[PDB]
């Protein structure tokens, strides 16, 4: 597994990153941070500092039990300023917990998942065949695969639009 | 006293307008409406059909007891597409109920008002002197005044960003 860290420079200023830069939640207030072109100024998003041009890579994401997270991967060109749709068309390929149910975020309609309570999810990115896949860690049961002809650097993606949920990288 | 009606062409498609076009609340889902350039496609806002370039006018607004509403006036050039900040610099001058607190929506910090409860508010717009003012109807007690050098037409503005509250024009 790749050893990843959240990129502070990308993080929506309302997000609180943990000291070790693996954990993320939504804060009560917009922090006063440098306005880097790479920082998401509206959508509640953060990328990992490491993105990938080729090869097979995987990592694990610990997930909160309550609504409000989405995670997976984003293309480097995902727009950082103004309200962006959270869709494959706008460069995001992700799972989401919303309305007490798990989804793969397709558009125009989201795709329901068929899993129990998720605690930890292995993300596997294959830039050779052009795919991102999600597995429930307990017994690596398959949750979902996006097939994508990725034509640029791809970054691990994390989003939290509610207080009282979270995401956290492992290892 | 001006008899205003809400302009359904401007209304965000999640908003539910009353048949006499006095009242507004937020609906659970977006309606499919003609995408006029004047329509707010993201912010939960609606304008009155009548705007004012000069003179002095006033009207009244019944307000829900619960969080989610904001009202006052907007300059015509308020951007209709994408997420706009709800601030004076972006062409909005409003009172807001949020977190059980009554606010004059100044920026970068909002201004908390001392008023315990509001049933009905009088908005007074004066383009001669260049100000917009709010009064509690009970005994016309002054709540707040924005001083604005208004350089274009100015519309009554209404916003409801959660279910379980409402606004309604009087008369």
């Amino acid at each position: 597994m790749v050893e990843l860290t959240l990129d502070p420079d990308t993080a929506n200023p309302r997000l609180i990153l943990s000291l070790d830069l693996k954990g993320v939640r939504l804060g009560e207030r917009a922090q006063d941070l440098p306005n880097h072109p790479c920082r998401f100024d509206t959508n509640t998003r953060v990328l990992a500092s490491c993105g990938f041009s080729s090869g097979r890579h995987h990592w694990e994401v610990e997930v909160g039990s309550k609504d409000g997270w989405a995670f997976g991967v984003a293309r480097e060109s995902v727009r950082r300023k103004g309200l962006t749709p959270f869709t494959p068309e706008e460069g995001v390929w992700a799972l989401q917990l919303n309305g007490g149910q798990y989804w793969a975020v397709t558009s125009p309609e989201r795709s329901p998942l068929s899993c129990g309570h998720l605690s930890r999810v292995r993300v596997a990115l294959d830039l050779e065949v052009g795919a991102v896949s999600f597995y429930a860690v307990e017994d690596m049961r398959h949750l979902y695969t996006f097939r994508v002809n990725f034509q640029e650097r791809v970054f691990p993606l994390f989003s939290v639009c509610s207080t009282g949920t979270y995401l956290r990288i492992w290892p | 006293m001006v008899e205003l009606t809400l302009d359904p062409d401007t209304a965000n498609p999640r908003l539910i307008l009353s048949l006499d076009l006095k009242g507004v609340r937020l609906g659970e889902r977006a309606q499919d409406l003609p995408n006029h350039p004047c329509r707010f496609d993201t912010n939960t806002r609606v304008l009155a059909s009548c705007g004012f370039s000069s003179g002095r006018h006033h009207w009244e607004v019944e307000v829900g007891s619960k969080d989610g509403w904001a009202f006052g006036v907007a300059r015509e050039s308020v951007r209709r597409k994408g997420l706009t900040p709800f601030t004076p610099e972006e062409g909005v001058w409003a009172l807001q109920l949020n977190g059980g607190q009554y606010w004059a929506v100044t920026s970068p910090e909002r201004s908390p008002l001392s008023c315990g409860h509001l049933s009905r508010v009088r908005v007074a717009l004066d383009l001669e002197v260049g100000a917009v003012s709010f009064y509690a109807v009970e005994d016309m007690r002054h709540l707040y005044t924005f001083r604005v050098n208004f350089q274009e037409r100015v519309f009554p503005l209404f916003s409801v960003c959660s279910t379980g509250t409402y606004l309604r024009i009087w008369p």
Binding site: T44, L83 | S162
Partner: peptide, 7 residues
């Protein structure tokens, strides 16, 4: 409700 639009 509307919070999910900022995802």
């Amino acid at each position: 409700g509307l919070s999910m639009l900022l995802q």
